[PDB]
Amino acid sequence: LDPGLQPGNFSADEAGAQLFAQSYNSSAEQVLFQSVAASWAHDTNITAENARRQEEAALLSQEFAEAWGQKAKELYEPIWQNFTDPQLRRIIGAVRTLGSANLPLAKRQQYNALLSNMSRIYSTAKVCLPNKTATCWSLDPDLTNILASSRSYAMLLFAWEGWHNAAGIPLKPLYEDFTALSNEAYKQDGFTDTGAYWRSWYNSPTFEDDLEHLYQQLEPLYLNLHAFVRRALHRRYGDRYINLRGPIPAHLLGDMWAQSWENIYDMVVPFPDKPNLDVTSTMLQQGWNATHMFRVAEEFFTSLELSPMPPEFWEGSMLEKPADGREVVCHASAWDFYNRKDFRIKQCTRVTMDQLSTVHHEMGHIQYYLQYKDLPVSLRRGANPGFHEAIGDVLALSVSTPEHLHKIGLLDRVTNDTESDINYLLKMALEKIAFLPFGYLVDQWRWGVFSGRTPPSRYNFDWWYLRTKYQGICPPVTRNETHFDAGAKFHVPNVTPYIRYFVSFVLQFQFHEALCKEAGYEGPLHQCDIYRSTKAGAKLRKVLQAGSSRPWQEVLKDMVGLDALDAQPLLKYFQLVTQWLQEQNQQNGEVLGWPEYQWHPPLPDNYPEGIDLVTD
Ligand SMILES: *[C@@H]1O[C@H](CO[C@@H]2O[C@@H](C)[C@@H](O)[C@@H](O)[C@@H]2O)[C@@H](O[C@@H]2O[C@H](CO)[C@@H](O[C@@H]3O[C@H](CO[C@H]4O[C@H](CO)[C@@H](O)[C@H](O)[C@@H]4O)[C@@H](O)[C@H](O[C@H]4O[C@H](CO)[C@@H](O)[C@H](O)[C@@H]4O)[C@@H]3O)[C@H](O)[C@H]2NC(C)=O)[C@H](O)[C@H]1NC(C)=O
Ligand SMILES: *[C@@H]1O[C@H](CO)[C@@H](O[C@@H]2O[C@H](CO)[C@@H](O[C@@H]3O[C@H](CO[C@H]4O[C@H](CO)[C@@H](O)[C@H](O)[C@@H]4O)[C@@H](O)[C@H](O[C@H]4O[C@H](CO)[C@@H](O)[C@H](O)[C@@H]4O)[C@@H]3O)[C@H](O)[C@H]2NC(C)=O)[C@H](O)[C@H]1NC(C)=O
Ligand SMILES: *[C@@H]1O[C@H](CO)[C@@H](O[C@@H]2O[C@H](CO)[C@@H](O[C@@H]3O[C@H](CO)[C@@H](O)[C@H](O)[C@@H]3O)[C@H](O)[C@H]2NC(C)=O)[C@H](O)[C@H]1NC(C)=O
Ligand SMILES: *[C@@H]1O[C@H](CO)[C@@H](O[C@@H]2O[C@H](CO)[C@@H](O[C@@H]3O[C@H](CO)[C@@H](O)[C@H](O)[C@@H]3O)[C@H](O)[C@H]2NC(C)=O)[C@H](O)[C@H]1NC(C)=O
Ligand SMILES: *[C@@H]1O[C@H](CO)[C@@H](O[C@@H]2O[C@H](CO)[C@@H](O[C@@H]3O[C@H](CO)[C@@H](O)[C@H](O)[C@@H]3O)[C@H](O)[C@H]2NC(C)=O)[C@H](O)[C@H]1NC(C)=O
Ligand SMILES: *[C@@H]1O[C@H](CO)[C@@H](O[C@@H]2O[C@H](CO)[C@@H](O[C@@H]3O[C@H](CO)[C@@H](O)[C@H](O)[C@@H]3O)[C@H](O)[C@H]2NC(C)=O)[C@H](O)[C@H]1NC(C)=O
Numbered sequence: 262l263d264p265g266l267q268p269g270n271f272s273a274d275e276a277g278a279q280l281f282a283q284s285y286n287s288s289a290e291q292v293l294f295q296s297v298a299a300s301w302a303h304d305t306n307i308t309a310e311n312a313r314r315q316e317e318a319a320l321l322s323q324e325f326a327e328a329w330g331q332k333a334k335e336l337y338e339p340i341w342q343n344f345t346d347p348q349l350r351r352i353i354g355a356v357r358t359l360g361s362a363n364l365p366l367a368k369r370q371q372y373n374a375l376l377s378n379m380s381r382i383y384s385t386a387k388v389c390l391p392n393k394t395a396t397c398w399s400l401d402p403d404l405t406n407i408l409a410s411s412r413s414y415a416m417l418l419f420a421w422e423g424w425h426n427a428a429g430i431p432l433k434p435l436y437e438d439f440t441a442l443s444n445e446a447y448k449q450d451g452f453t454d455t456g457a458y459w460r461s462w463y464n465s466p467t468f469e470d471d472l473e474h475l476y477q478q479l480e481p482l483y484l485n486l487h488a489f490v491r492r493a494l495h496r497r498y499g500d501r502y503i504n505l506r507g508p509i510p511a512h513l514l515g516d517m518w519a520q521s522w523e524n525i526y527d528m529v530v531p532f533p534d535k536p537n538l539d540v541t542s543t544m545l546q547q548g549w550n551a552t553h554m555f556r557v558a559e560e561f562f563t564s565l566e567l568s569p570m571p572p573e574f575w576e577g578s579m580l581e582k583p584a585d586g587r588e589v590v591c592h593a594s595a596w597d598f599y600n601r602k603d604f605r606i607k608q609c610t611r612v613t614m615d616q617l618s619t620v621h622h623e624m625g626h627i628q629y630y631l632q633y634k635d636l637p638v639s640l641r642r643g644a645n646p647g648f649h650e651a652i653g654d655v656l657a658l659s660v661s662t663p664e665h666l667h668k669i670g671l672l673d674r675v676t677n678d679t680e681s682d683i684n685y686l687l688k689m690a691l692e693k694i695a696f697l698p699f700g701y702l703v704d705q706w707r708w709g710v711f712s713g714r715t716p717p718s719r720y721n722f723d724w725w726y727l728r729t730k731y732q733g734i735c736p737p738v739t740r741n742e743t744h745f746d747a748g749a750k751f752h753v754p755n756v757t758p759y760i761r762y763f764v765s766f767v768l769q770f771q772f773h774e775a776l777c778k779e780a781g782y783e784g785p786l787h788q789c790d791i792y793r794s795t796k797a798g799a800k801l802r803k804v805l806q807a808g809s810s811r812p813w814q815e816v817l818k819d820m821v822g823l824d825a826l827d828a829q830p831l832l833k834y835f836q837l838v839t840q841w842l843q844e845q846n847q848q849n850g851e852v853l854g855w856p857e858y859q860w861h862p863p864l865p866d867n868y869p870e871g872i873d874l875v876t877d
């Protein structure tokens with residue numbers, strides 16, 4: 262048994278715990294490196310050969326965590342909370358979390374394979390017309406593309422139900438057992454249930470209470486936005502299917518999960534005549550190419566006097582669709598090998614304005630890793646799990662502005678037209694604000710499941726109850742206790758929390774408002790840029806530098822000034838769209854909210870016979 266993989270002898274003392282932690286850090290980064298190294302190899306070079314390695318390196322990592330966790334859990338758990346330095350408590354607290362590993366091996370297999378099956382079913386789920394069609398439609402491209410692009414209610418419904426039938430129905434039996442074993446494992450760790458464990462990451466004694474108050478402060482913005490989309494859908498589909506006072510059919514909102522309303526912008530766009538300024542056409546004539554795009558992004562960070570990329574980045578990063586033509590996970594991602602000496606971005610970059618914005622986002626993560634690279638490995642993560650995304654986003658917000666684009670040189674004049682930016686801001690409002698209630702209700706639901714507030718006979722009653730109460734949606738078809746629509750969202754059977762994204766979105770604008778205030782800027786917040794503001798850069802740098810050492814709330818108070826999340830900065834960013842929508846809503850007499858919730862559409866006249874009929 263490798264000494265580099267198994268812990269030694271240590272007393273229950275802080276001096277012992279310090280020695281143990283230090284030993285954990287040294288071996289831990291070694292282990293993490295191997296796992297990610299093969300991961301990067303396969304992800305950058307898609308082949309079954311590397312997949313076998315990826316599986317092997319990840320397997321080793323768990324045995325490592327079990328060895329150290331095993332010793333830690335037995336050794337300090339009776340005393341650990343008393344260690345003086347919170348720094349030490351944080352490291353030990355992370356390692357002492359064993360999770361599933363606690364299960365006896367017979368249950369481990371049952372729990373582990375079970376999780377594997379849930380993932381298979383979701384990705385495997387196939388939706389087939391009630392005809393012996395030669396080939397069915399998978400989640401993407403066909404199902405997502407047809408649902409995002411199609412606008413024939415009859416057609417759109419059938420695709421939506423088919424997905425929930427195929428994905429949802431088979432997960433329901435399995436998910437109960439996962440609930441049983443998952444909570445069983447965490448009980449041995451010391452959490453009342455899986456929910457208590459997920460909430461534990463934010464170190465907020467009133468965490469769930471905090472979110473409700475945040476969400477109630479955003480609801481005025483959401484209801485106004487919801488009312489406007491409801492009206493627009495009514496113009497397109499007709500009163501038979503959109504009750505001005507009631508909830509919106511879930512399948513008509515432009516995406517399989519109604520989590521993003523981005524695809525309906527074409528119907529709702531204010532001031533439809535102003536074109537969205539796309540710099541692609543100028544970018545091409547400028548001779549720019551993917552490789553230069555990244556150095557352009559670095560220049561922005563250098564303007565913020567943050568750390569410029571290490572040469573290791575230019576060497577490692579997989580900036581393009583490789584000319585070798587070997588397969589790659591072209592979906593852009595940012596990687597940090599816990600090896601202090603390197604960090605890499607995988608973009609598969611192609612020259613579009615969107616990717617320019619995307620590259621800035623990804624480079625923000627790299628910047629984030631570099632600033633806390635000095636901390637011990639257990640702390641080299643976001644201040645809170647949602648904190649990581651927020652930093653990446655705020656950087657992306659600043660660069661999207663035409664004010665910034667002119668500074669880079671891609672634009673001759675910064676036309677200060679309110680119709681142009683409202684057009685833009687509404688697309689963002691459809692893209693992300695519509696997401697908040699959804700991101701909140703999924704983890705709102707899951708804590709209920711793990712907590713038992715939703716016993717098994719209610720998996721679907723509560724999901725639609727919650728989904729309607731918060732998001733303002735009801736199902737396209739009456740659905741009952743045989744179903745398990747929770748299983749229809751990727752994050753559910755893959756057991757990945759959603760709350761991180763909701764909290765991240767509030768933190769995104771909360772940081773943004775802080776930097777603008779630091780940058781001496783004034784007036785419209787959505788016209789703010791942090792470029793060249795070194796004094797703001799130092800403030801941002803501080804928040805990154807702390808990593809996970811300091812409790813997330815304590816750091817946030819130093820940055821923005823408030824010990825907790827708040828909606829006020831987010832609202833100010835959207836002040837213009839808030840003002841404009843209310844007038845549009847006020848004129849039409851929209852009922853803000855959704856009384857008479859117990860209303861939903863009739864079925865299509867010949868459903869499912871009429872599902873392919875031309876209606877455009
Ligand atoms: C991605 O784009 C990279 C950026 O290219 C620059 O920016 C774009 C927007 C255009 O304006 C382009 O014309 C720019 O060069 C690109 O890197 C560039 O690659 C080109 C070749 O494709 C290189 O051209 C050579 O440049 C040198 C001079 O550059 C050095 O010195 C100047 C100062 O004098 C510095 O400002 C530079 O930064 C460099 O340090 C020339 O000596 C050489 O001249 C040759 O041609 C002329 C006739 O035109 C002859 O008289 C000479 O004798 C030579 O035969 C080349 O013109 C360029 O160096 C390089 N940029 C930089 C900054 O080094 C990259 O290739 C693109 N990548 C991909 C994958 O597409
Ligand atoms: C978590 O675990 C890892 C692994 O143990 C620790 O990583 C080490 O971090 C230290 C610094 O904290 C690194 O030390 C640096 O080494 C450089 C030389 O490296 C070469 O030489 C050594 C042998 O001497 C070889 O082993 C190595 O492979 C290289 O060939 C120095 O140049 C550095 O100088 C800096 O520090 C000195 C003081 O030490 C200053 O006076 C200088 O001004 C300069 O700032 C430095 O000494 C070490 O290399 C890292 N090892 C690994 C494997 O990454 C983490 O630090 C640890 N986390 C915590 C919180 O302890
Ligand atoms: C941590 O230190 C402990 C000692 O406090 C080490 O445990 C001891 O390890 C040795 C082998 O390395 C074991 O030896 C065996 O002892 C039995 C009698 O106990 C004897 O009959 C055998 O022939 C053999 O000599 C010993 O049992 C074991 N004792 C205990 C209490 O664990 C341990 O190796 C150290 N662990 C690490 C990770 O460094
Ligand atoms: C993408 O991943 C695959 C799998 O890891 C890599 O394929 C392997 O590449 C090496 C050389 O690049 C091959 O080794 C060579 O094989 C020949 C024939 O036996 C031998 O004459 C050489 O001496 C050397 O051993 C290897 O066989 C090949 N395949 C496998 C399964 O390992 C590929 O290189 C990766 N591409 C990139 C760009 O990283
Ligand atoms: C995850 O899903 C797979 C697929 O449903 C499960 O594997 C299957 O598990 C069952 C028993 O749990 C095996 O049943 C056996 O089938 C053979 C005929 O194939 C029959 O002769 C035996 O009497 C028995 O009924 C089935 O073979 C097995 N399939 C494979 C490919 O191994 C797996 O058990 C599921 N995991 C969990 C935790 O539910
Ligand atoms: C939950 O509600 C679902 C409806 O979404 C009910 O499932 C449906 O149940 C009916 C019968 O109760 C099924 O129709 C029957 O089909 C056969 C031919 O297959 C026909 O001969 C009968 O006359 C009748 O039309 C329907 O296929 C079935 N659909 C699904 C998706 O299950 C279910 O009964 C409800 N369950 C509970 C516990 O309330």
Ligand SMILES: *[C@@H]1O[C@H](CO)[C@@H](O)[C@H](O)[C@H]1NC(C)=O
Binds near residue numbers: 342
């Ligand atoms: C330390 O132990 C004492 C005595 O059991 C207990 O009162 C105290 O709460 C512990 N410290 C922490 C931080 O829980």
Ligand SMILES: *[C@@H]1O[C@H](CO)[C@@H](O)[C@H](O)[C@H]1NC(C)=O
Binds near residue numbers: 664
């Ligand atoms: C655009 O015009 C408004 C007029 O009130 C002004 O407040 C805003 O600062 C202007 N933006 C820029 C970038 O000049």
Ligand SMILES: [Zn+2]
Binds near residue numbers: 622626650653
């Ligand atoms: Zn990101």
